[PDB]
């Protein structure tokens, strides 16, 4: 009676914990955490930039933050929802290689209209480079493959397609690794 409208239902918590890579306490603290600030549970694009800023506070242009929100919103409604943030955040921790790879392509292309161009690849690389600049937690001295893709992909797009398409990206990513090596840090080889 009234209290039922507090905290998320336990049935979904159990099924959500089945897949989360995080513990139930971390999910409830996050849910109750921003829920108090926004009882609706729906965060605007700026809200997503704020939490992203916490993960990457050494950033500045924030262009990378809004860019993610632009292609990180499943409903593209201009706002991140509680189910999308908690579920998407869990995928960000370490979802299936296929799920994490999908998030990589969405971010790799700002308008991800199915075709990727080098200007978009360089623009996104600079976006994550500035966010990963300073020392928030950049990989090794500079694993971020910027010039590496310029030559590596330039070699793969010689076919003369005129553009870069997921057909070569996804097939090359599963055929010739390094093409999608995310600059993210890997917990281990297992």
Asked if residue 161 binds Ca ion (CB under 5 A), the reply is yes
Residue of 15, 44, 60, 77 interacting with Ca ion (CB under 5 A): 77
* Separation of alpha carbons 101 and 104, rounded Å: 5
Per-residue binding letters, 112-131, with Ca ion (x by CB under 5 A): -x------------------
Q: Any contact of residue 40 with Ca ion (CB under 5 A)?
A: no
24 near Ca ion, rule: CB under 5 A: no
- Tell the smallest beta-carbon distance from residue 115 to Ca ion (Å): 5
Tokens of 130: 């500035």
| Residue 44 within binding range of Ca ion, rule CB under 5 A | no
Could you tell me if 143 and 183 are in contact, meaning their C-beta atoms sit under 8 angstroms apart? yes
Q: Cα–Cα–Cα angle for 153, 156, 162, nearest 5°?
A: 90
How far is residue 110's CA from residue 112's CA, in Å, rounded to a whole number? 6
3-state secondary structure of 80: strand
**Sign of the Cα pseudo-torsion (137, 142, 148, 150, in order):** positive
Q: Provide the annotated binding site for Ca(2+).
A: 73, 75, 77, 79, 81, 84, 109, 111, 113, 115, 120, 157, 159, 161, 163, 168
Where along the sequence are the contacts to Ca ion (CB under 5 A)?
Answer: 73, 75, 77, 81, 84, 109, 111, 113, 157, 161, 168
């Amino acid at each position: 009676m009234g209290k039922s409208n507090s905290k998320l239902k336990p049935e979904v918590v159990e099924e959500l914990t089945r897949k989360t890579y995080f513990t139930e306490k971390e999910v409830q603290q996050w849910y109750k955490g921003f829920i108090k600030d926004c009882p609706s549970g729906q965060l605007d694009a700026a809200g997503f930039q704020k939490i992203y800023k916490q993960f990457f506070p050494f950033g500045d242009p924030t262009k990378f933050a809004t860019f993610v929100f632009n292609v990180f919103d499943e409903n593209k409604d201009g706002r991140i929802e509680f189910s999308e943030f908690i579920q998407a955040l869990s995928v960000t921790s370490r979802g299936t290689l296929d799920e994490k790879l999908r998030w990589a392509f969405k971010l790799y292309d700002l308008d991800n209209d199915g075709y990727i161009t080098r200007n978009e690849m360089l623009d996104i690389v600079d976006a994550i480079y500035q966010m990963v600049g300073n020392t928030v937690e950049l990989p090794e001295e500079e694993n971020t493959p910027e010039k590496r893709v310029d030559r590596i992909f330039a070699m793969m797009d010689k076919n003369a397609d005129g553009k870069l398409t997921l057909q070569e990206f996804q097939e090359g990513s599963k055929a010739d690794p390094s093409i999608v090596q995310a600059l993210s840090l890997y917990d281990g080889l297992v």
